[PDB]
Design a protein around this ligand. Structure first.
Ligand SMILES: C[C@](COC(N)=O)([C@@H](Nc1c(C=O)cc2cc(C(N)=O)ccn12)C(=O)O)S(=O)O
Length: 244
């Protein structure tokens, strides 16, 4: 059927079209496949930005800093977006990328317990520095695309070091799409507080047959660029490969 050359060329063109530089790592079993127009990005470290919420939620829930039904009330102070000026659960904050909610969860957890938990799960370079409420947005915490797909892979298969129920609670927060019998779980991310700006879309597809195929899209976000491009490129790549 389709040659590997054609698949690589098609996915590369998806990034070229967006006029940006990026990569998308696909994992099948133990095998990693790297596609895109800037393959060397696969092993380079970038702030995780919003993708860190996945782990933030895992930690908070596990260490009883919150429950999946707890409503984090908006304090009435102006937020970056109107959509964030409301009361929401962790899951809702997850789908809305409600950073203010996760900064509160981070503060509840505390620096010491956070550094110890990040270290314990071995996330990225595992360094969160001294500011417990922004280490995943402007550093020092960093992680590579390869590490992100492995994290997605682990969560998808419940291999992370947390109660089975905790991982399941968080996975439920990540369902972002259903395509032709396939379910797509993922967390987007956009580090605007760093230069250059990094974009993420890390998750996995759950196929009808039950097989889970993890992936991590990582690229450079440029102003005047839509966050939906990450989603378009990811879906087109997944589809081109016949994943969905
Ligand atoms: C593009 C997304 C999601 O956007 C949707 N889905 O609406 C999101 N980005 C993000 C993230 C997570 O990366 C973290 C912040 C922090 C700020 C701040 N001012 O302190 C501003 C935007 N922040 C956004 O700005 O809207 S990202 O894919 O999570």
């Amino acid at each position: 059927h389709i040659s590997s050359q054609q698949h690589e060329k098609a996915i590369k063109s998806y990034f070229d079209e967006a006029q940006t530089q990026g990569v998308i790592i696909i994992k099948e079993g133990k095998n990693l496949s790297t596609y895109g127009n800037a393959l060397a990005r696969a092993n380079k470290e970038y702030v995780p930005a919003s993708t860190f919420k996945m782990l933030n939620a895992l930690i908070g829930l596990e260490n009883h800093k919150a429950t999946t039904n707890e409503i984090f009330k908006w304090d009435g102070k102006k937020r970056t977006y109107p959509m964030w000026e409301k009361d929401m659960t962790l899951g809702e904050a997850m789908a809305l990328s409600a950073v203010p909610v996760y900064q509160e969860l981070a503060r509840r957890t505390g620096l010491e317990l956070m550094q110890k938990e990040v270290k314990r799960v071995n996330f990225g370079n595992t360094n969160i520095g001294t500011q417990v409420d922004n280490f995943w947005l402007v550093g020092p915490l960093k992680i590579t695309p390869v590490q992100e797909v492995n994290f997605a892979d682990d969560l998808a298969h419940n291999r992370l070091p947390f109660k089975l129920e905790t991982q399941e609670e968080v996975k439920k927060m990540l369902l972002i799409k259903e395509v032709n019998g396939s379910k797509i779980y993922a967390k987007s991310g956009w580090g605007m507080g760093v230069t250059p700006q990094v974009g993420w879309l890390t998750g996995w597809v759950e196929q009808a047959n039950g097989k889970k195929i993890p992936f991590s899209l990582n690229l450079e976000m440029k102003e005047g660029m839509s966050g939906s491009i990450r989603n378009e490129i990811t879906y087109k790549s997944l589809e081109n490969l016949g994943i969905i």
